[PDB]
């Protein structure tokens, strides 16, 4: 009972951008008020929590292109 597996993916992709002039970008947030009351806080096994955040981001990638590629081969008898 012979088994023969061949996994030959080809990818010639191009995630491309072109942008002549990126700019003149103003991010002027006007402040705020945050209150959080808790008694107890238990966490376990790969928890990702934020509690009480006042957070400003300005993110101007000239490019900002992303490619995510997952090859997963699994074999069981």
Q: Which residue has the tokens 């003149």?
A: 24
d(CA 20, CA 30): 31
Q: What approach was used to elucidate this structure?
A: cryo-EM
Q: For residues 33 and 71, is the Cβ–Cβ distance under 8 A?
A: no
Dig out the tokens for 20 from the structure: 């002549």
d(CA 21, CA 62): 9
Dig out the tokens for 3 from the structure: 């088994």
Q: Which residue has the tokens 């929590």?
A: 49
Q: DSSP letter for 24, please.
A: -
């Amino acid at each position: 009972g012979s088994v023969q597996i061949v996994y030959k993916p080809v990818d010639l992709s191009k995630v491309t951008s072109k942008c002549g002039s990126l700019g003149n970008i103003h991010h002027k947030p006007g402040g705020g008020q945050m209150e959080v009351k808790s008694e107890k806080l238990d966490f376990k096994d790969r928890v990702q929590s934020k509690i009480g955040s006042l957070d400003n981001i300005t993110h101007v990638p000239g490019g900002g292109n992303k490619k995510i590629e997952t090859h997963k081969l699994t074999f069981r008898e």
